[PDB]
PDB file of N, CA and C in Angstrom:
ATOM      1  N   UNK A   1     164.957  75.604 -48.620  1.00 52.94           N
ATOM      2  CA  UNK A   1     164.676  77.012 -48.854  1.00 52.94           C
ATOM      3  C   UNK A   1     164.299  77.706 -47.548  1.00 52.94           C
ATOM      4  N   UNK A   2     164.524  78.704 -47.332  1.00 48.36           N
ATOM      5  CA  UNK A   2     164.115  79.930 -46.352  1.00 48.36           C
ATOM      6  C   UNK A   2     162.966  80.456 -46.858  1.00 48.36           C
ATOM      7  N   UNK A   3     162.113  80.682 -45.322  1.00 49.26           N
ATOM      8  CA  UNK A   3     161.237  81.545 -45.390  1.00 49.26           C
ATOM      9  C   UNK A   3     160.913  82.247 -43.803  1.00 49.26           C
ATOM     10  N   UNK A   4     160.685  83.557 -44.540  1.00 49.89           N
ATOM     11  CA  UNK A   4     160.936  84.345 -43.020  1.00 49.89           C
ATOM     12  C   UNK A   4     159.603  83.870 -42.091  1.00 49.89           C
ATOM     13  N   UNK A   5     158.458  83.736 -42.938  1.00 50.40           N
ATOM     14  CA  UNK A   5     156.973  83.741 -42.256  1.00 50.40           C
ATOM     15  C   UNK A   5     157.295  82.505 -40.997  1.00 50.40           C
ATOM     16  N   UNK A   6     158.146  81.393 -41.339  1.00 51.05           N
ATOM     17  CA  UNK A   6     158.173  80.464 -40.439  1.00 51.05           C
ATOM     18  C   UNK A   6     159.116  80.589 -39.552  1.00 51.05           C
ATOM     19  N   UNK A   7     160.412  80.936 -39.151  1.00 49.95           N
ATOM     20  CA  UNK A   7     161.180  81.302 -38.355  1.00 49.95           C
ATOM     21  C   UNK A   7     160.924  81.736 -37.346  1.00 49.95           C
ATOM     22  N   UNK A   8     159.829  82.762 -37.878  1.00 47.57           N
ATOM     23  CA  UNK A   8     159.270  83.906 -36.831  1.00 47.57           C
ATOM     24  C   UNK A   8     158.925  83.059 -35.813  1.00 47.57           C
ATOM     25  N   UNK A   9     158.777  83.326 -34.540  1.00 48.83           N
ATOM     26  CA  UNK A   9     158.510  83.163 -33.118  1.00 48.83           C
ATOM     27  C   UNK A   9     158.699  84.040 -31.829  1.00 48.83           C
ATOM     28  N   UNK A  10     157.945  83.365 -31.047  1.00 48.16           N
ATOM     29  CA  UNK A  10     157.585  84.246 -29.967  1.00 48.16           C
ATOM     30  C   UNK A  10     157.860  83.492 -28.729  1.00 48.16           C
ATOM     31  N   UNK A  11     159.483  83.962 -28.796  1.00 49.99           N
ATOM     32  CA  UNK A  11     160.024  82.778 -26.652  1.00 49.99           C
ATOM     33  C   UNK A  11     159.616  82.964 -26.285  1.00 49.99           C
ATOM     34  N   UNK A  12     159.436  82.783 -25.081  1.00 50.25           N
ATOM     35  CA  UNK A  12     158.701  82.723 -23.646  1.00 50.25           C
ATOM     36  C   UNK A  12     159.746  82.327 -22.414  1.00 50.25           C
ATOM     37  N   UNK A  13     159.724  83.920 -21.361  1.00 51.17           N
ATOM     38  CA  UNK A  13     160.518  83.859 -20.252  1.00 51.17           C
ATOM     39  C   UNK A  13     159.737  84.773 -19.113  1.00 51.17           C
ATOM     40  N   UNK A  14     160.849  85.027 -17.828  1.00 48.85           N
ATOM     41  CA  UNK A  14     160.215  85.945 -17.286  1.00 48.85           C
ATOM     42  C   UNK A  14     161.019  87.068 -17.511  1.00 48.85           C
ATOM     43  N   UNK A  15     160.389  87.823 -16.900  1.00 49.50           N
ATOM     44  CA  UNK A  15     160.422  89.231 -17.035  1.00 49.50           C
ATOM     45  C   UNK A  15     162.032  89.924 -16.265  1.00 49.50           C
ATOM     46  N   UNK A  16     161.983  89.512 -15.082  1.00 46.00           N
ATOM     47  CA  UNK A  16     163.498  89.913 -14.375  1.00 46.00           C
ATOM     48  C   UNK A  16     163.314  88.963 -13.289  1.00 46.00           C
ATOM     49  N   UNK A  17     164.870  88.691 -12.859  1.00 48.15           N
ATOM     50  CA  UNK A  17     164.321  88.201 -11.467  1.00 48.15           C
ATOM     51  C   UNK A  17     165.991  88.031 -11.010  1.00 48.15           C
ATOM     52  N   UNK A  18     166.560  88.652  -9.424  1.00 48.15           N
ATOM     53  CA  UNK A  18     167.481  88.394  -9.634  1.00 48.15           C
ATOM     54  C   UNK A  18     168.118  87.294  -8.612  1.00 48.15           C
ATOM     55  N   UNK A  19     168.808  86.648  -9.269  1.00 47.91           N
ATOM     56  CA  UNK A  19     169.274  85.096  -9.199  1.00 47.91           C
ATOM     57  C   UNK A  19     170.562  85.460  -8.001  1.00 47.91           C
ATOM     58  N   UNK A  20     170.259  84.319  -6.681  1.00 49.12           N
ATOM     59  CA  UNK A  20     170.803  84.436  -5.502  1.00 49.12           C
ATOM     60  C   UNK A  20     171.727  83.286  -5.326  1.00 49.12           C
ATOM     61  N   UNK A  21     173.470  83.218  -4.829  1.00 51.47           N
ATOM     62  CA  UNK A  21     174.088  82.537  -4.812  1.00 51.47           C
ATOM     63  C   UNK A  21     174.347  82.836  -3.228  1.00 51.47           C
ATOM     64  N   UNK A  22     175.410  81.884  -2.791  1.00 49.61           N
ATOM     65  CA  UNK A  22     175.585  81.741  -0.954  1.00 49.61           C
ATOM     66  C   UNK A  22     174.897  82.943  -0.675  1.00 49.61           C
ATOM     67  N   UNK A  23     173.444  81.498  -0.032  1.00 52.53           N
ATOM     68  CA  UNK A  23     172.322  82.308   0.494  1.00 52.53           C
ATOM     69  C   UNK A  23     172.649  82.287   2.048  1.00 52.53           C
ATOM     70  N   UNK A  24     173.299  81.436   2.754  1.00 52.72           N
ATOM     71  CA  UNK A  24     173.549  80.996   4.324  1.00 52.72           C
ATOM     72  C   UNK A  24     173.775  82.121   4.937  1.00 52.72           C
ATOM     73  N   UNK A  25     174.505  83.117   3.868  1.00 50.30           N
ATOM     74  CA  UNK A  25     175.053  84.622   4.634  1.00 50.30           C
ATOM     75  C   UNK A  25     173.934  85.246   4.955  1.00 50.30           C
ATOM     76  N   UNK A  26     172.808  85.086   4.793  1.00 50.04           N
ATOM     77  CA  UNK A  26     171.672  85.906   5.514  1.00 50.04           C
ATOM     78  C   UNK A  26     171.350  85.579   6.606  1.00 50.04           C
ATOM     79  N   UNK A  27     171.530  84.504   7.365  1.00 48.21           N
ATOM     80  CA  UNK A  27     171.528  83.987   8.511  1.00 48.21           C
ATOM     81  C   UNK A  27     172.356  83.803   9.228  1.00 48.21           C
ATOM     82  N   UNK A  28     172.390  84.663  10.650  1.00 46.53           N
ATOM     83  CA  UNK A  28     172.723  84.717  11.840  1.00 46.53           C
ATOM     84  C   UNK A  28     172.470  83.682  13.050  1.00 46.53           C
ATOM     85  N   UNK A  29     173.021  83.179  13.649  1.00 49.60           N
ATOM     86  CA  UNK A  29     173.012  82.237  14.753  1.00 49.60           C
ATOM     87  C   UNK A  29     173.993  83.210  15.939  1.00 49.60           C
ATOM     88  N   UNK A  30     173.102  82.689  17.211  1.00 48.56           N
ATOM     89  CA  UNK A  30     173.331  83.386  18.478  1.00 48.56           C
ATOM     90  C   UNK A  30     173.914  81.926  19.613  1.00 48.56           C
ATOM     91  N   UNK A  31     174.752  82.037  20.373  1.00 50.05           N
ATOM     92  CA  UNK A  31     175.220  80.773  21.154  1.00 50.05           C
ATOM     93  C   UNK A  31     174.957  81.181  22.261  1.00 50.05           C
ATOM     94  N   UNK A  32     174.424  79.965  22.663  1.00 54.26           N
ATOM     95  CA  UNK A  32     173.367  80.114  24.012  1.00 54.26           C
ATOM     96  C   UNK A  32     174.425  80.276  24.925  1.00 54.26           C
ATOM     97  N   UNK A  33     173.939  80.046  26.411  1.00 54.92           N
ATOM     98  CA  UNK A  33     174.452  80.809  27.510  1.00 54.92           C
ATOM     99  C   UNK A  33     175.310  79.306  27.413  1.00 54.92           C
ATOM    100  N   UNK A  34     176.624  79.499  27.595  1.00 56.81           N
ATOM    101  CA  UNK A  34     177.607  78.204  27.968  1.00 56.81           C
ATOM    102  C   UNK A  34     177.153  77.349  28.904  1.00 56.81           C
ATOM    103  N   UNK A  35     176.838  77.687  30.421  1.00 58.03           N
ATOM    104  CA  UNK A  35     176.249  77.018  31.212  1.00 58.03           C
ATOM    105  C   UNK A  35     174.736  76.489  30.758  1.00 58.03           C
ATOM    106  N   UNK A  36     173.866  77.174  30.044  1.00 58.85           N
ATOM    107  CA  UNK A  36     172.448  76.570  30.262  1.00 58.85           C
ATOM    108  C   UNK A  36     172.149  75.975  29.065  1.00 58.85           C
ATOM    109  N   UNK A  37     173.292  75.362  28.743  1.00 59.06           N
ATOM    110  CA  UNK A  37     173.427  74.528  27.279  1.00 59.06           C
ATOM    111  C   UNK A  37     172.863  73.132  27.707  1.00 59.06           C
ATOM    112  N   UNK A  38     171.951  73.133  26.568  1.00 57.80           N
ATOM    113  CA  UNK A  38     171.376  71.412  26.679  1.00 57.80           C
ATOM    114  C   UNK A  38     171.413  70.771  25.857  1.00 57.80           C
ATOM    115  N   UNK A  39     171.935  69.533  26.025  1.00 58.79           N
ATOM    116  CA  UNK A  39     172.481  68.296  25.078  1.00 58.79           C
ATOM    117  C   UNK A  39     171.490  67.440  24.328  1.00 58.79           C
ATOM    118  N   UNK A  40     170.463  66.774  24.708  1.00 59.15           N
ATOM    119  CA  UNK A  40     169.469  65.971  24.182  1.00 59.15           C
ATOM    120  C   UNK A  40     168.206  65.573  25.320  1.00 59.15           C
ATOM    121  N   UNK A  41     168.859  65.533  26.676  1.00 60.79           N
ATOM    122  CA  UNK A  41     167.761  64.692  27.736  1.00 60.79           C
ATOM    123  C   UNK A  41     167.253  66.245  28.629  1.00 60.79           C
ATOM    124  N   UNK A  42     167.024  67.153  28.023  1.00 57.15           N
ATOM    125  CA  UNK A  42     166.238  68.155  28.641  1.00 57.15           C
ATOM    126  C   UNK A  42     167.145  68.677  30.275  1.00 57.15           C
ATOM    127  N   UNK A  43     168.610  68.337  29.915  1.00 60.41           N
ATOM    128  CA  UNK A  43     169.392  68.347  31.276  1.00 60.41           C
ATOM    129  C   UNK A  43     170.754  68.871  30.803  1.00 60.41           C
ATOM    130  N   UNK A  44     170.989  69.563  31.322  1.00 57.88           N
ATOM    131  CA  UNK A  44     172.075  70.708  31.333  1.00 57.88           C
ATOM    132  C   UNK A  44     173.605  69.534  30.992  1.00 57.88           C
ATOM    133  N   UNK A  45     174.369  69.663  30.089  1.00 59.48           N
ATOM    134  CA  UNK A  45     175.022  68.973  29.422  1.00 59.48           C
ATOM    135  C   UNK A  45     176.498  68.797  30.422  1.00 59.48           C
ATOM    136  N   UNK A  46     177.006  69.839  30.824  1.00 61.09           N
ATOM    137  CA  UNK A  46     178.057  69.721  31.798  1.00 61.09           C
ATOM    138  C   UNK A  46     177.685  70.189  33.573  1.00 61.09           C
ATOM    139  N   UNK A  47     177.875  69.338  34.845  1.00 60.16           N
ATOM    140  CA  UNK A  47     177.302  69.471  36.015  1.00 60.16           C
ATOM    141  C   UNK A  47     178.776  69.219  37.053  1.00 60.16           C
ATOM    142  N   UNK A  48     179.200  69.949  37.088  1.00 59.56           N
ATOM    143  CA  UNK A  48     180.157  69.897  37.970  1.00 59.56           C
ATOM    144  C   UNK A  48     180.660  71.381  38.944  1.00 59.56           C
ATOM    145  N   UNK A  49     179.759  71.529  39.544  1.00 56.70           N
ATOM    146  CA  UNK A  49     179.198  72.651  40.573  1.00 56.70           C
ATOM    147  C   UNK A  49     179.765  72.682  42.033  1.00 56.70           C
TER     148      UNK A  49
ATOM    149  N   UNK B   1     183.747  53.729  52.965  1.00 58.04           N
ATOM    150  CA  UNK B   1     183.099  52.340  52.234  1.00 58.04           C
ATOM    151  C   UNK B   1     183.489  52.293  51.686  1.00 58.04           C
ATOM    152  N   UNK B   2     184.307  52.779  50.091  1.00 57.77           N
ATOM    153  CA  UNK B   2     184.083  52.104  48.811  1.00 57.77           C
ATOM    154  C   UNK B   2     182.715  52.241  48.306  1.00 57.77           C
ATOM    155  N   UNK B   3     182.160  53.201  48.411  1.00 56.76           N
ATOM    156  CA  UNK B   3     180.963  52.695  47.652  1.00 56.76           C
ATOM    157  C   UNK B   3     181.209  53.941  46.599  1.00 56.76           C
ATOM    158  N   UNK B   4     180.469  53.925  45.339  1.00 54.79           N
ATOM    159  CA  UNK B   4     180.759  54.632  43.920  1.00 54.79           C
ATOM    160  C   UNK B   4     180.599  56.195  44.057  1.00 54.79           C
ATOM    161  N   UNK B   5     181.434  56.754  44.090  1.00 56.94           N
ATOM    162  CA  UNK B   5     181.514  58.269  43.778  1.00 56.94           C
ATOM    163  C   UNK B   5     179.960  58.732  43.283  1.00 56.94           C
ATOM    164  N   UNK B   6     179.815  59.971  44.205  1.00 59.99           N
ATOM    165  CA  UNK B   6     178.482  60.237  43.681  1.00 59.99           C
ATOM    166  C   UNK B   6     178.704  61.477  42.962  1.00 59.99           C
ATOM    167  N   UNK B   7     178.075  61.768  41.735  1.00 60.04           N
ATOM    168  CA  UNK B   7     178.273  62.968  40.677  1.00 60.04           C
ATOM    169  C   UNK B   7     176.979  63.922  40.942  1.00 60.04           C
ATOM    170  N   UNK B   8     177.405  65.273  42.135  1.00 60.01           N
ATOM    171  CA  UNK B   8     176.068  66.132  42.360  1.00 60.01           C
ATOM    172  C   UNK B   8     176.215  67.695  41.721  1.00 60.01           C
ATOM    173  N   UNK B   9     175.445  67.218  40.656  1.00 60.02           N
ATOM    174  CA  UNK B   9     175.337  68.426  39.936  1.00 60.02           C
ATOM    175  C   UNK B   9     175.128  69.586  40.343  1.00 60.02           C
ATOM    176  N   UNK B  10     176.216  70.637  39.929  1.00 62.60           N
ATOM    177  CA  UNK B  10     175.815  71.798  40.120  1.00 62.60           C
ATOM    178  C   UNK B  10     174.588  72.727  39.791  1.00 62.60           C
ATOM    179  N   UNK B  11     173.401  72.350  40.713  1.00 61.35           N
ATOM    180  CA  UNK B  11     172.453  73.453  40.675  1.00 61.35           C
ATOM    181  C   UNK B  11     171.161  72.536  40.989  1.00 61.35           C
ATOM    182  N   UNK B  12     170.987  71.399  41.196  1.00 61.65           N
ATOM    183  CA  UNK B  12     169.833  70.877  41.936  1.00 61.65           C
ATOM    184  C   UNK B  12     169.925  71.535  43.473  1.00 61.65           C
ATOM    185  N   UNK B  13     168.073  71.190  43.831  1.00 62.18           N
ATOM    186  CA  UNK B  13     167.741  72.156  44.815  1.00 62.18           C
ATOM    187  C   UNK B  13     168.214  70.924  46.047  1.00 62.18           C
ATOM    188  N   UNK B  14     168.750  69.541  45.847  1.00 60.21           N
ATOM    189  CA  UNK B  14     169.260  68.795  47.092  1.00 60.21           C
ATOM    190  C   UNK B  14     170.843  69.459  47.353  1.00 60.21           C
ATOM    191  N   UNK B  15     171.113  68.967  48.542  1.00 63.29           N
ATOM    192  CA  UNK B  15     172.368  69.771  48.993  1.00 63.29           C
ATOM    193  C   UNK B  15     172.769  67.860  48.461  1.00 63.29           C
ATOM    194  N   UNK B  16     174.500  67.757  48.383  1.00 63.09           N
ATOM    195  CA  UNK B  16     175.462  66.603  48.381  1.00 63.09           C
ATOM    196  C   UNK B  16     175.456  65.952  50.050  1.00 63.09           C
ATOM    197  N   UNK B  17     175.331  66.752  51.056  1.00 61.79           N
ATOM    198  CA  UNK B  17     175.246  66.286  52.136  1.00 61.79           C
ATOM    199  C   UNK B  17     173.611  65.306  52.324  1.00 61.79           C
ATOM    200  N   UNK B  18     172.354  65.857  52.011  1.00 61.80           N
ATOM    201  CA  UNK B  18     171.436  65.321  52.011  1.00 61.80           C
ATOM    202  C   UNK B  18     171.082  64.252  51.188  1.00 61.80           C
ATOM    203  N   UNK B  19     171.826  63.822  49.764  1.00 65.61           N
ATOM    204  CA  UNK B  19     172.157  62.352  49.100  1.00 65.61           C
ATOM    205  C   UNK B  19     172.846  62.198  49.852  1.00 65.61           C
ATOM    206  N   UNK B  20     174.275  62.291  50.801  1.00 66.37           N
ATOM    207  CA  UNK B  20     174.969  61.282  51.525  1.00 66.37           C
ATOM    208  C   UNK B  20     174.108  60.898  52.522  1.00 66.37           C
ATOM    209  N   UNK B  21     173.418  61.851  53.644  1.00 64.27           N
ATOM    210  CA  UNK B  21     172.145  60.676  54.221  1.00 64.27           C
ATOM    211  C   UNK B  21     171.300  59.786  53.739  1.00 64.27           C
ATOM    212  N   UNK B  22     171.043  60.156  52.677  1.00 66.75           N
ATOM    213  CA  UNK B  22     170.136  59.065  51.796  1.00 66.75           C
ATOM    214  C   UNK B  22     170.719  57.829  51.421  1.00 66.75           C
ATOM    215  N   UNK B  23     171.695  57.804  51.783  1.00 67.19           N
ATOM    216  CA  UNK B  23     172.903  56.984  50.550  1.00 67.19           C
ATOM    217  C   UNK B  23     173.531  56.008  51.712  1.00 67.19           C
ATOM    218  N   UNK B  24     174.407  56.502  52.360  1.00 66.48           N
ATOM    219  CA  UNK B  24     174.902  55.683  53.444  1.00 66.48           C
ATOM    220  C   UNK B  24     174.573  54.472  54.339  1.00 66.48           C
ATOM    221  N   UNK B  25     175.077  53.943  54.993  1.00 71.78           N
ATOM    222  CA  UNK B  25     173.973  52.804  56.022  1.00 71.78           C
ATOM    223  C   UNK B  25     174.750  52.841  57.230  1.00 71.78           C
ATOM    224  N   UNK B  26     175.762  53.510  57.491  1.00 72.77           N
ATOM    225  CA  UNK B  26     176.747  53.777  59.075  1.00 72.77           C
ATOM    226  C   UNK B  26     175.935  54.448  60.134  1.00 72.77           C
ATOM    227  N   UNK B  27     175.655  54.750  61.056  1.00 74.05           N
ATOM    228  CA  UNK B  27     174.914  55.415  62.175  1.00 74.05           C
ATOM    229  C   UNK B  27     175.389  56.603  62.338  1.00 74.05           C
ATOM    230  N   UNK B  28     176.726  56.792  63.183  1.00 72.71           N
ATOM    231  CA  UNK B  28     177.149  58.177  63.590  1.00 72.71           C
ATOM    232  C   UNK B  28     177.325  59.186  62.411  1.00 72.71           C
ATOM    233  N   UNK B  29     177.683  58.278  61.597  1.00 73.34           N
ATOM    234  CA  UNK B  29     177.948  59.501  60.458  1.00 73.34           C
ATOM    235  C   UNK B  29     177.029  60.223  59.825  1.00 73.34           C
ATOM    236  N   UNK B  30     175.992  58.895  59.415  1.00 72.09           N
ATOM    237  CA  UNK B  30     174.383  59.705  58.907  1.00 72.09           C
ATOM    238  C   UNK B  30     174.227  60.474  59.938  1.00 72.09           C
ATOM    239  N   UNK B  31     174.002  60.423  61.281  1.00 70.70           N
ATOM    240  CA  UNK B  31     173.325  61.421  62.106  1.00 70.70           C
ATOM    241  C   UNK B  31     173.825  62.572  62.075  1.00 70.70           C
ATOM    242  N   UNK B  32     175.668  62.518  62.205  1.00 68.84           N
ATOM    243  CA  UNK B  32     175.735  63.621  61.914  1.00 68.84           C
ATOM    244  C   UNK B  32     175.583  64.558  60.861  1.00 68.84           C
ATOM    245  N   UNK B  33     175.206  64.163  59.789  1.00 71.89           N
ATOM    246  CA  UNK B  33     175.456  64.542  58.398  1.00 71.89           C
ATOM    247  C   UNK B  33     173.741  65.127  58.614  1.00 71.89           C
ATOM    248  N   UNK B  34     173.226  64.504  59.329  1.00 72.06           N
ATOM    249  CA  UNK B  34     171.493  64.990  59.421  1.00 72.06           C
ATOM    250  C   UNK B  34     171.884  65.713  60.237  1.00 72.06           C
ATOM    251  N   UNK B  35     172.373  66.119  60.985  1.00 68.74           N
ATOM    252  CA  UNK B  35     172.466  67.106  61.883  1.00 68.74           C
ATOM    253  C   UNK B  35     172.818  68.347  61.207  1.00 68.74           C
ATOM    254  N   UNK B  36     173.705  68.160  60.439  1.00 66.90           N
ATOM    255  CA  UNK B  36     174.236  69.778  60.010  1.00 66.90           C
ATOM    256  C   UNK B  36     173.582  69.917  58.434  1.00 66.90           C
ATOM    257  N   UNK B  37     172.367  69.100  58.296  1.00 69.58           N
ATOM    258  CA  UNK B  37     171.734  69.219  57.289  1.00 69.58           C
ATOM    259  C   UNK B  37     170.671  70.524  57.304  1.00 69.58           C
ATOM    260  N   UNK B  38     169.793  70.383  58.464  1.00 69.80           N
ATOM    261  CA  UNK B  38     168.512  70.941  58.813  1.00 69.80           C
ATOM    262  C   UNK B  38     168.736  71.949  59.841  1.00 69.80           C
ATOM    263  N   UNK B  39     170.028  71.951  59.930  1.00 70.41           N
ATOM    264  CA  UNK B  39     170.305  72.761  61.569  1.00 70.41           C
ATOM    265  C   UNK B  39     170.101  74.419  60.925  1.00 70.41           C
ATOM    266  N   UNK B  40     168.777  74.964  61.485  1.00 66.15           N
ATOM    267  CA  UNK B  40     168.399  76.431  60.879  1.00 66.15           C
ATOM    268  C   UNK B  40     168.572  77.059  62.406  1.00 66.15           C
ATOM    269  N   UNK B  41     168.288  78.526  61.718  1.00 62.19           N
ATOM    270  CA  UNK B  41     168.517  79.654  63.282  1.00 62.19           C
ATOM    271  C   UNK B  41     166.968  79.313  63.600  1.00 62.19           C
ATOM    272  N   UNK B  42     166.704  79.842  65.069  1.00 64.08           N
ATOM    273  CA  UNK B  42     165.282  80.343  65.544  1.00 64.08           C
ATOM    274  C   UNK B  42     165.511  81.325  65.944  1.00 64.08           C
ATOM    275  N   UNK B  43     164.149  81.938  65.143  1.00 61.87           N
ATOM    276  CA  UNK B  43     163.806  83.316  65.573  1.00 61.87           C
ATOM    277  C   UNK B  43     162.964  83.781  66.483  1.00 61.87           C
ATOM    278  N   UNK B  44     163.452  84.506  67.799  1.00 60.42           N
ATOM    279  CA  UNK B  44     163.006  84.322  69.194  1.00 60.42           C
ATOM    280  C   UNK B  44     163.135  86.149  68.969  1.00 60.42           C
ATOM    281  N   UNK B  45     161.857  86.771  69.397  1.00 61.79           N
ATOM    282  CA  UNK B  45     161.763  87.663  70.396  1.00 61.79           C
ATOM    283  C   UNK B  45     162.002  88.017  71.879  1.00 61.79           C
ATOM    284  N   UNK B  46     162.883  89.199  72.120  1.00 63.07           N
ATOM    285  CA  UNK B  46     163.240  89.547  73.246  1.00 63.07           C
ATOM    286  C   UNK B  46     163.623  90.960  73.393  1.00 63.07           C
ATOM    287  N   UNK B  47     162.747  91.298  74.659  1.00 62.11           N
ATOM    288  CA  UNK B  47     162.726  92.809  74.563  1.00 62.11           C
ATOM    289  C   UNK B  47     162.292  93.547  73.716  1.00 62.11           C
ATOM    290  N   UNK B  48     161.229  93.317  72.623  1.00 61.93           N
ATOM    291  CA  UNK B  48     161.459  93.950  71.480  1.00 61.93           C
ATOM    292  C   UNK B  48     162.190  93.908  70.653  1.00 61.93           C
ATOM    293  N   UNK B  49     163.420  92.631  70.534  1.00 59.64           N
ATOM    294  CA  UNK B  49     164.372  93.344  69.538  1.00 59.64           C
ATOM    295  C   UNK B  49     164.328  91.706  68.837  1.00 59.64           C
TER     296      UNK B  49
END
């Protein structure tokens, strides 16, 4: 049998929120100076001067 | 000589001539190579000018 008194309920969510897909596009990257590029040992990666 | 190619990076404050004095063990050649290492002007007054 049905009864309305029990059905009744009260979900629970939030309120708004809006949902973000390819987030990477907000970030910008800048490339360092070609020459004063450093590789790993704190020393300029190409030396032929 | 034969002795191993030396790799002098572009932009240390040694000149390639001043590792080849360091480096070598021949006489005339180090000297000369010290010679046109250090060889600066002097600055001499005369007349005022």
């Amino acid at each position: 049998q049905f009864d309305f008194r029990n059905s009744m309920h009260m979900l629970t969510s939030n309120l708004t929120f809006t949902v973000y897909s390819d987030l990477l596009a907000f970030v910008s990257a800048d490339t360092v100076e070609p020459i004063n590029a450093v590789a790993f040992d704190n020393m300029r990666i190409m030396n032929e001067l | 000589f034969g002795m191993q190619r030396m790799h002098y990076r572009n932009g240390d404050p040694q000149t390639p001539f001043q590792i080849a004095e360091q480096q070598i063990q021949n006489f005339q050649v180090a000297n000369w190579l010290h010679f046109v290492n250090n060889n600066y002007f002097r600055q001499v007054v005369i007349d005022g000018v």
